[PDB]
Design a protein around this ligand. Structure first.
Ligand code: NI
Length: 304
């Protein structure tokens, strides 16, 4: 709904996930970067989006959509990746989640249109993957038994503008300050601050990850635990090693995750373009020859 200039739009909270969708992304570190889109530009108008779930929490039921969002609407889609059950080792399980499993077993990134999506586990940084991993690994004798439950919820679909984007004020200042002549290091600094890539569409939502720790010889005496522990979702006996969990999106106040996710999402199942494409359309003439440099540096940066 478009309001009309005589309704105040300060009323409306910005659509959830708006700041996050505006950030660049680094394909190599799997880290987010600084803002690429201007997350708070409204283009002199009041565009609102309906939240049908408002009782669970006009003006209470509508959020404001920044201009750089061509589309945003809410969803509630749930994918449960209940695993395949057995697994001899933990690293094998987490590595084979990425390489060997379908898209409902994790989060995806894809480049461009026909750019087939890459499954990136949970979608944290490479250093965060090696902290959930290092702090996890420590637990076993000589690798016994691991199951995984993983749930993915999409709380919104969105699509970024392709034409006439409003670039973040700071990024535009950084661009304007790069030299006309090619200097790798300086453009590499730009890539580190703003990203390898920026998002053009995807989902808002989150992930809840479980990994059950089972004791071979145990189940022996007394797949089966996975089935049952999935019920516990929807310290005691039972070879209950210790259910380890990872979570993205939502906020405390933990299937309170489910209730709160829509209002505190992260970006998932997203499409992206190399950072330099951001300036290929979208106004700003003079700064073109800086795109060849930015392309060149990106190519070098990714060869690393
Ligand atoms: Ni949709």
């Amino acid at each position: 709904s478009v309001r009309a200039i005589d309704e105040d739009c300060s009323q409306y909270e910005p659509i959830p996930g708006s700041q996050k969708a505006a950030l660049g992304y680094n394909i190599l570190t799997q880290e987010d970067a600084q803002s690429v889109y201007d997350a708070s530009y409204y283009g002199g108008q009041c565009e609102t989006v309906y939240n049908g779930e408002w009782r669970e929490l006009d003006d209470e039921k509508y959020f404001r959509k920044p201009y750089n969002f061509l589309k945003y609407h809410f969803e509630a889609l749930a994918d449960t990746g209940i695993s395949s059950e057995f697994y001899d080792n933990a690293n094998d399980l987490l590595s084979k989640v990425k390489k060997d499993k379908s898209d409902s077993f994790g989060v995806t990134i894809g480049i461009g249109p026909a750019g087939s999506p890459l499954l990136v586990g949970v979608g944290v940084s490479h250093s965060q993957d090696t902290s959930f991993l290092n702090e996890l690994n420590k637990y076993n004798e000589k690798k016994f038994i691991f199951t995984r439950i993983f749930t993915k919820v999409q709380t919104a679909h969105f699509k970024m503008r392709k034409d006439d984007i409003m670039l973040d004020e700071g990024m535009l200042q950084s661009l304007m300050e790069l030299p006309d002549q090619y200097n790798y290091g300086m453009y590499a600094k730009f890539i580190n601050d703003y990203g390898t890539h920026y998002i053009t569409s995807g989902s808002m939502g989150g992930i809840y990850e479980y990994i059950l720790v089972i004791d071979k010889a145990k189940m022996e005496s007394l797949x089966x635990x996975x089935x049952x522990x999935x019920x516990x979702x929807x310290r005691k006996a039972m070879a209950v090693e210790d259910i380890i969990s990872r979570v993205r999106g939502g906020s405390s106040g933990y299937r309170s995750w489910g209730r709160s996710l829509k209002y505190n999402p992260v970006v998932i199942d997203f499409e992206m373009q190399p950072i330099h494409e951001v300036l290929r359309h979208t106004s700003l003439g003079p700064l073109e020859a800086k795109r060849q440099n930015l392309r060149r540096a990106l190519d070098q940066y990714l060869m690393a």
